[PDB]
Write an enzyme that holds these catalytic residues in place. Sequence first.
Site, mmCIF file in Angstrom:
data_model
loop_
_atom_site.group_PDB
_atom_site.id
_atom_site.type_symbol
_atom_site.label_atom_id
_atom_site.label_comp_id
_atom_site.label_asym_id
_atom_site.label_seq_id
_atom_site.Cartn_x
_atom_site.Cartn_y
_atom_site.Cartn_z
ATOM 1 N N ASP A 56 64.901 60.888 50.286
ATOM 2 C CA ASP A 56 66.283 60.778 51.350
ATOM 3 C C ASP A 56 65.563 60.360 52.566
ATOM 4 O OD1 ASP A 56 68.474 60.220 52.561
ATOM 5 O OD2 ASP A 56 69.095 62.460 52.600
ATOM 6 N N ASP A 73 68.239 54.097 55.180
ATOM 7 C CA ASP A 73 68.360 55.192 54.490
ATOM 8 C C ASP A 73 68.499 54.968 53.039
ATOM 9 O OD1 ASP A 73 69.313 57.846 53.746
ATOM 10 O OD2 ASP A 73 71.450 57.278 54.567
HETATM 11 C C1 6Z0 Z 1 71.782 64.569 53.258
HETATM 12 C C2 6Z0 Z 1 72.794 63.114 52.474
HETATM 13 C C3 6Z0 Z 1 72.806 63.240 50.942
HETATM 14 C C4 6Z0 Z 1 72.634 62.141 50.448
HETATM 15 C C5 6Z0 Z 1 72.950 62.154 48.904
HETATM 16 N N1 6Z0 Z 1 72.393 60.930 48.357
HETATM 17 C C6 6Z0 Z 1 72.864 60.594 46.915
HETATM 18 O O1 6Z0 Z 1 73.738 61.064 46.113
HETATM 19 C C7 6Z0 Z 1 72.451 59.192 46.531
HETATM 20 C C8 6Z0 Z 1 73.335 58.389 45.595
HETATM 21 C C9 6Z0 Z 1 72.897 57.048 45.306
HETATM 22 C C10 6Z0 Z 1 71.554 56.223 46.219
HETATM 23 C C11 6Z0 Z 1 71.435 55.293 45.703
HETATM 24 N N2 6Z0 Z 1 70.750 54.143 45.555
HETATM 25 C C12 6Z0 Z 1 71.267 57.211 47.224
HETATM 26 N N3 6Z0 Z 1 71.665 58.502 47.323
HETATM 27 C C13 6Z0 Z 1 73.382 63.083 48.271
HETATM 28 C C14 6Z0 Z 1 73.644 64.313 48.854
HETATM 29 C C15 6Z0 Z 1 73.364 64.263 50.268
HETATM 30 F F1 6Z0 Z 1 73.613 65.457 51.173
HETATM 31 N N4 6Z0 Z 1 71.789 61.989 52.932
HETATM 32 C C16 6Z0 Z 1 72.012 61.056 53.169
HETATM 33 N N5 6Z0 Z 1 71.225 59.793 53.539
HETATM 34 O O2 6Z0 Z 1 73.326 60.639 53.579
HETATM 35 C C17 6Z0 Z 1 74.318 61.473 53.103
HETATM 36 C C18 6Z0 Z 1 73.861 62.825 53.364
HETATM 37 F F2 6Z0 Z 1 73.804 62.970 54.787
HETATM 38 F F3 6Z0 Z 1 74.899 63.820 52.779
#
Ligand code: 6Z0
Length: 385
Positions: free
Chosen positions: A37, A227
């Site tokens: 991430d 991101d």
């Molecule tokens: C911390 C966090 C976060 C991301 C995820 N991210 C996903 O589930 C996810 C799913 C599909 C893809 C693709 N292609 C990328 N990431 C899950 C939980 C979080 F907590 N990271 C983020 N970059 O934005 C949302 C968020 F802040 F909530």
Amino acid sequence: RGSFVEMVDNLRGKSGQGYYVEMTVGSPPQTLNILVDTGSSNFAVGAAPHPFLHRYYQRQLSSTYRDLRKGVYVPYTQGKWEGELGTDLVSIPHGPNVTVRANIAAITESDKFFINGSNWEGILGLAYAEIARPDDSLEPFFDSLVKQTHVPNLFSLQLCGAGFPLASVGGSMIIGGIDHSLYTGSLWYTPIRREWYYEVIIVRVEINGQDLKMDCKEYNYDKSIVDSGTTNLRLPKKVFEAAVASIKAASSTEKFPDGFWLGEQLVCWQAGTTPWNIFPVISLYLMGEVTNQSFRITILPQQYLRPVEDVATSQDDCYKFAISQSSTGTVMGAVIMEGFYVVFDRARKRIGFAVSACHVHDEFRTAAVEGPFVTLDMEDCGYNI
Ligand SMILES: C[C@]1(c2cc(NC(=O)c3ccc(C#N)cn3)ccc2F)NC(=N)OCC1(F)F
Ligand code: NA
Ligand code: NA
């Protein structure tokens, strides 16, 4: 420099569930899969038997765990996690041959965080300390890695997306360098505006070559970021309105329900008959390295129309429109990143884009990175708080 065969293909995933890397925590090593991430800055892992988890970090089994005697509660727009802070020894088996002492948030309670049916058990926040929780004194993993070893201060990501008929996703995280087999053409670099998120400045937006002609500040209201932990290309609301109006117009040979464009419903086609041609390309011009110089990255509907496999309702090839409105600025999620090899050149405060050797395209169009262009007043495109 330039060749890292041991790290190639070290990412795995399933459509809609993100891209994860294998890591180990503790002594003896406990293996976990960890979501990569670039949009957050904590290393946080499941540490209790939540039912969605394949496994979790058992601190009691590690001889090298050190308790920080401090907790953190981390709410997001949807859901949250809470954990206990400590340090332990961390390695990436398909990464550099080093072991470092990193901060780890042991997640003890969560809501809408873990995904039911996914194969990852934690998150690796690769962004900067400014956005670490609880505050910027909690050193991010990558900062620890670079401080404690000779690994160069950069990493690169190649995220290789999916298409029907449904295979796992994959890709590569090259830690401490670049692997030139992962892209074609040249890398073009955009400055990291500020070290918090991987913040960049978008200076122009086109839909099939047609400029949206907005005040470029609108494109970065209130920020634009790169991101890997977000699926969609998210656009500020005003920009999204303009972009979707333009995309609808360009695709108007076929008509789709309004709900499709708002991500409220899927659209499905008879297998193998997805009409890619009717959908336009999307181009973002980014601030270049030199005064009055920019370059542009271009993605295809293969990136922004996401296959949805788990649809019991239907027999056909179903897709979600993955450009969406935002109130947090532009988010260049996997929809963008899956077109490119992306170099997070932290040492030089810049992000490189090159055409990905693995990206999904067709016989008529490919993703593109092209420059130079002449673009004046690019510093005005940045939003200020
Ligand atoms: C911390 C966090 C976060 C991301 C995820 N991210 C996903 O589930 C996810 C799913 C599909 C893809 C693709 N292609 C990328 N990431 C899950 C939980 C979080 F907590 N990271 C983020 N970059 O934005 C949302 C968020 F802040 F909530
Ligand atoms: Na170092
Ligand atoms: Na190359």
